[PDB]
Paper text:
Inteins are protein elements that remove themselves from their precursor proteins in an autocatalytic pathway called protein splicing. In the first step of the canonical class 1 inteins, the scissile peptide bond upstream of the intein rearranges in an N–S (or N–O) acyl shift involving the cysteine (or serine) side chain as the first amino acid of the intein (residue 1) and the upstream flanking amino acid of the N-extein (residue (–1)). The M86 mutant of the Ssp DnaB intein (here referred to as WT intein) was selected by sequential directed evolution for its more general activity and is one of the few known intein mutants with improved extein promiscuity.
Strikingly, the functional complementation of the catalytic His73 through a large (–1) side chain also extended to a single H73A mutant of the M86 intein. Here, splicing activity was restored, whereas the same intein with the native Gly(–1) was completely inactive. Again, this hypothesis was confirmed by the crystal structure of the G(–1)F/H73A mutant, which revealed that significant changes are indeed restricted to the N-terminal splice junction. The effects are even more pronounced in the M86(G(–1)F/H73A) mutant. Here, the dihedral angle φ of the Ala1 residue is twisted to –76°, which represents a marked change of up to 91° relative to the other M86 structures. The resulting twist rotates the carbonyl of the scissile peptide bond toward the space liberated by the missing His73 side chain. The new space has also accommodated a water molecule (water 5), which is not present in the other two structures. This water molecule seems to stabilize the twisted conformation by coordinating the carbonyl oxygens of Phe(–1) and of the block G His153. The overall distortion of the plane with the scissile peptide bond, described by the angle ω, increases from the M86 intein (ω = 179°) to the G(–1)F mutant (ω = –173°) and the G(–1)F/H73A double mutant (ω = –159°). In particular the latter structure, with 21° off from the optimal trans-conformation, suggests that the mutations have a significant effect on the stability of the peptide bond.
Numbering used by the authors: -6 to -1, 1 to 99, 115 to 163
Amino acid sequence: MLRESFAISGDSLISLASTGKRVPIKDLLGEKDFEIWAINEQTMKLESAKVSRVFCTGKKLVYTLKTRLGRTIKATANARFLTIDGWKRLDELSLKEHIALPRKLQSDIYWDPIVSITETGVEEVFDLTVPGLRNFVANDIIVHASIEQDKLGG
């Protein structure tokens, strides 16, 4: 299973680096070893990175997060986003935070303030594991990847 879940709504659109297409994460549950876009925090550049496994974490409460440019995602309270002061849980974010977005359309990260965080409802939620960089782009937002438990029990 997962050591810890940072799950997001199944409707979240995952940018697939190989094909340049976006696919809802719920539709990736039976897929593995495909490439996503992830931030390398050491270089602040986006890199292609391989997903090892997709997980369905069950029904959970989700919250809609919105940034100024209009980026939006539905995620659990435990999903993590990258702020100027490091990774934070969705339920730790406030309107004073900026979150990291991949640049769209010089740097690779654009920092955008949060304008809304709202409880939305209960949905099936999903996680990706991304060994190494441990993050991926969903709905054009950087989100942290979950951590799989060691096969022996971890």
